[PDB]
Amino acid sequence: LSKELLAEYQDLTFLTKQEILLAHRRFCELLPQEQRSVESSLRAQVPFEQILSLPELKANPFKERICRVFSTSPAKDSLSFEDFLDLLSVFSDTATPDIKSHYAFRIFDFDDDGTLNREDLSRLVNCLTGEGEDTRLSASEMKQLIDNILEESDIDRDGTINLSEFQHVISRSPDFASSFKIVL
Ligand SMILES: [Ca+2]
Ligand SMILES: [Ca+2]
C-alpha cells in the first residue's frame, strides 16, 4: 500500500454527499455568510487559521506535517475542508489496522522521507511525554534506550526502522505494541 493508491481514494471516493452537505454548513458559519455561494465554496479553498478552529487535530505535535502530507496544494498556503475533514472522520473509526499502520508510519516519519531514525522515535515518545520539559529527552540514556530496543526487537540492527520493521517492532513486544493503541 503506497501513497499512490491512497491518492486515488482521496480523489472523489472519500467525499460523500451527506457529510459534505452537513460539513459545508458547519464550515460556512465560520466563513462570511455572504459567501454561502456553493459555486464559490467548492471553487474556493479554506484559510489555514480557519482550520485551526479545531484544537482536535491540533493536539498532534505535527499537525502541520499531518495536514501537509495528507492535504494537497500548490504553494501549500491553503487547506481544503474536504481532505481535512476526511482525515478526521477516517481517523475517527474507519481507522482499520491496515490503514492504521500505513497512516502511522507516514506520520511517524518526521522527516516524511520514509525511513525512521533514532530521532523520529525520540520525537513521538517525547512529544507525547510532555513537550517542553527535561522529561524523556534526547540524551545518553535515551540513546541506549532506542538502541537496546532495536537490538532486542530487530536483529539486522540496521540502525533504523522501516515500514516492515515498524509494523513488527511495534507489535513485536509489549513495548510500543500496547501503546500502539491510538497515535496521531
Ligand atoms: Ca526519517
Ligand atoms: Ca531494524
From Swiss-Prot:
Bilayer topology term: Lipid-anchor
Major subcellular site: membrane
Record flagged with keyword Cell membrane: yes
Tissue specificity field: Ubiquitously expressed. Expressed in the epidermis, hair follicles and keratinocytes. Detected in platelets and in cell lines of megakaryocytic and erythrocytic lineages. Both isoform 1 and isoform 2 are detected in various cancer cell lines, with isoform 2 being the predominant form (at protein level).
UniProt effect for mutating residue 160 to A: No effect on phosphorylation by PKD/PRKD2; in isoform 2
GO molecular function, one term: calcium ion binding
Effect of residue 120 to N: Cytoplasmic localization
UniProt cross-references to Pfam families, sorted A to Z: EF-hand_7
Binding-site list for Ca(2+) 2: 154, 156, 158, 160, 165
Binding positions for Ca(2+) 1 per the UniProt entry: 109, 111, 113, 115, 120
GO CC annotation: apical plasma membrane; axon; cell periphery; centrosome; cytoplasm; endoplasmic reticulum; extracellular exosome; filopodium tip
Impact reported for residue 165 to Q: Cytoplasmic localization
Domain (EF-hand): residue spans on this chain: 96-131, 141-176
Matching InterPro entries: CIBP, EF-hand-dom_pair, EF_Hand_1_Ca_BS, EF_hand_dom
GO biological process, one term: cell adhesion
Induction note: Up-regulated during breast cancer progression.
Keywords, in A-Z order: Angiogenesis, Apoptosis, Calcium, Cell adhesion, Cell cycle, Cell division, Cell membrane, Cell projection, Cytoplasm, Cytoskeleton, Differentiation, Golgi apparatus, Lipoprotein, Magnesium, Membrane, Metal-binding, Myristate, Nucleus, Phosphoprotein, Repeat, Spermatogenesis
Subcellular location: Membrane; Cell membrane, Sarcolemma; Cell membrane; Apical cell membrane
Record's subunit section: Monomer. Interacts with MYO1C. Interacts (via C-terminal region) with PPP3R1 and CACNA1C; the interactions increase upon cardiomyocytes hypertrophy. Interacts with the heterodimeric integrin alpha-IIb/beta3 (ITGA2B-ITGB3). Interacts with ITGA2B (via cytoplasmic domain); the interaction is direct and calcium-dependent. Interacts with the protein kinases PLK2/SNK and PRKDC (via the region immediately upstream of the kinase domain). Interacts with PLK3; the interaction inhibits PLK3 kinase activity. Interacts with PSEN2. Interacts (via C-terminus) with F8. Interacts with NBR1 (via C-terminus). (Microbial infection) Interacts with human papillomavirus 4/HPV4 protein E8, human papillomavirus 5/HPV5 protein E1, and human papillomavirus 16/HPV16 proteins E2 and E5.
PANTHER family, A to Z: CALCIUM AND INTEGRIN BINDING FAMILY MEMBER 2, CALCIUM AND INTEGRIN-BINDING PROTEIN 1
Record note on domains: The EF-hands may also bind magnesium ions in the presence of high Mg(2+) levels and low Ca(2+) levels.
Involvement in disease: Epidermodysplasia verruciformis 3: A form of epidermodysplasia verruciformis, a rare genodermatosis associated with a high risk of skin carcinoma that results from an abnormal susceptibility to infection by specific human papillomaviruses, including the oncogenic HPV5. Infection leads to the early development of disseminated flat wart-like and pityriasis versicolor-like skin lesions. Cutaneous Bowen's carcinomas in situ and invasive squamous cell carcinomas develop in about half of the patients, mainly on sun-exposed skin areas. EV3 inheritance is autosomal recessive.
Role played: Calcium-binding protein that plays a role in the regulation of numerous cellular processes, such as cell differentiation, cell division, cell proliferation, cell migration, thrombosis, angiogenesis, cardiac hypertrophy and apoptosis. Involved in bone marrow megakaryocyte differentiation by negatively regulating thrombopoietin-mediated signaling pathway. Participates in the endomitotic cell cycle of megakaryocyte, a form of mitosis in which both karyokinesis and cytokinesis are interrupted. Acts as a restriction factor that promotes keratinocyte-intrinsic immunity to human beta-papillomaviruses (HPVs).
Note: The binding of either calcium or magnesium significantly increases the structural stability of the protein in comparison to apo-CIB (calcium- and magnesium-free form).
Protein name per Swiss-Prot or TrEMBL: Calcium and integrin-binding protein 1
Name of the gene encoding the protein in the UniProt record: CIB1
